[PDB]
Amino acid sequence: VNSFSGYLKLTDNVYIKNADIVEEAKKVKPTVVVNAANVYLKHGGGVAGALNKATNNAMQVESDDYIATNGPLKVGGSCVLSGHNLAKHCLHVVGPNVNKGEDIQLLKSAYENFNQHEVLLAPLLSAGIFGADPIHSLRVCVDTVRTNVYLAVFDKNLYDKLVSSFLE
Numbered sequence: 451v452n453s454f455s456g457y458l459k460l461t462d463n464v465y466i467k468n469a470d471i472v473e474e475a476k477k478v479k480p481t482v483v484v485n486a487a488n489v490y491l492k493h494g495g496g497v498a499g500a501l502n503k504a505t506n507n508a509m510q511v512e513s514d515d516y517i518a519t520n521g522p523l524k525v526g527g528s529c530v531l532s533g534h535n536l537a538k539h540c541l542h543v544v545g546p547n548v549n550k551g552e553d554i555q556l557l558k559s560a561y562e563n564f565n566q567h568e569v570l571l572a573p574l575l576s577a578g579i580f581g582a583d584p585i586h587s588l589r590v591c592v593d594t595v596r597t598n599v600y601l602a603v604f605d606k607n608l609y610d611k612l613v614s615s616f617l618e
């Protein structure tokens with residue numbers, strides 16, 4: 451149903467809110483929720499862990515079956531699988547992990563995947579333990595994505611910094 455509410459409008463197609471992406475998925479019932487995935491779709495911690503646990507592990511079981519037959523994704527790539535109880539579809543997107551020496555330039559390719567969907571609920575790619583500068587990730591999102599993206603950022607201090615920095 452895509453019933454998003456409480457978002458700050460950054461541009462004509464990018465919105466942001468201080469919220470857990472899992473609680474937003476349950477309230478909004480989006481067509482697409484983006485996962486902050488890794489290439490073997492191992493959803494143990496962070497955003498992926500929170501989404502998988504909200505599916506009661508159904509996301510991990512389906513992801514393991516996909517990897518068995520198809521192998522790992524590439525950094526900057528994506529894969530549409532079921533959204534289970536959270537969304538119609540889950541778009542698993544692999545942003546670069548700069549804390550593990552991956553190339554930050556591939557962050558643009560990661561966001562380009564969003565342009566295949568009219569509207570998406572998404573986390574801020576390559577932030578948290580993946581190490582990218584969160585202000586840089588938001589700029590790559592705004593400059594790359596054309597479709598309507600609702601960013602859920604589950605940390606008040608980071609949210610307040612991103613908004614303040616964007617409004618400079």
Ligand SMILES: CC(C)[C@H](Nc1ncnc2[nH]ccc12)c1ccc2c(c1)S(=O)(=O)CCO2
Nearest residue numbers: 470471486496497500577578579580604605
């Ligand atoms: C920057 C934080 C606040 C953000 N966490 C979140 N953002 C939105 N809903 C959330 N629910 C639970 C955590 C969570 C974030 C965004 C991207 C990201 C990771 C974390 S990660 O470290 O798990 C792996 C790389 O990708």
